[PDB]
Structures are given as C-alpha cells and as structure tokens.
C-alpha cells in the first residue's frame, strides 16, 4: 500500500478532498468564457457593416 502510493503520482495528487482550488478553476473558467462571448458579440456587431 505504501509502495503503490509512493510510485504513483495521480493517487497522491488526488488524496480525496476538494481546498477552494476547484472553485478558483470555476471562477477563471466563467470569467474567461463571458469575456470571450462579449468580445465576439462586439466583433459580430462591428463586422456586419
């Protein structure tokens, strides 16, 4: 059990619990998506002339 733990990286990185880093991933995901949508809307509005 200690050997399998020691030799595998994934099973040590994901040691069960979620700190707030998942919520920070969700914040960078949502902020970068909506700004892309806004700039694409601006481009769509401007280019149609």
């Amino acid at each position: 059990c200690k050997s399998l733990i020691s030799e595998n990286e994934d099973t040590k990185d994901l040691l069960s619990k979620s700190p707030s880093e998942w919520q920070d991933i969700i914040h960078q995901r949502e902020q970068e998506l909506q700004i892309k949508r806004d700039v694409l809307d601006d481009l769509y509005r401007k280019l149609q002339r």
Binding site: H27, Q31, E32, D38, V39, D42, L43, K46, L47, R49
Partner: protein, 70 residues
C-alpha cells in the same frame, strides 16, 4: 496578300480622325471620373481597414486584460 491584309487592318483605317478626336476626349473624361471613383473606393476601403484596426486593438486589449485578470 499580307500587304493587303495589313493595310486594311490599321485600326480606324476607314474612320475619320475627328470622331477619333471626340472619342479620345470623352475617354479622358470618363477616365477622370474613373480615377475619381477609385478615390472614393480607396478612401472607404481605408475607412473599413481603420474600423478593422480599431476592433483588432479593442479585442487584443480585452484578451490582455482578461488573461492578466487571474
């Protein structure tokens, strides 16, 4: 026979030079209007290219301040 087929083929060989002269004059006229039209064409092409430069700059600024927001 090449002599015959070349002397009858001078362009306007059977056309009086004075209508040659009105057609030339109106050619320079319509030329004046065609470079004029090209001057509006190029000015509005530059206007759309400047609009394209402005939206490029705005989009680049949006990318820059978004990827440095976090």
């Amino acid at each position: 026979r090449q002599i015959n087929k070349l002397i009858d083929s001078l362009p306007g060989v059977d056309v009086s030079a004075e209508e040659q002269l009105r057609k030339i004059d109106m050619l320079q006229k319509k030329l004046v209007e065609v470079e004029d039209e090209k001057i509006e064409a190029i000015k509005k092409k530059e206007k759309l290219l400047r609009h394209v430069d402005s939206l490029i700059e705005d989009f680049v600024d949006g990318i820059a301040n978004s990827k440095k927001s976090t």
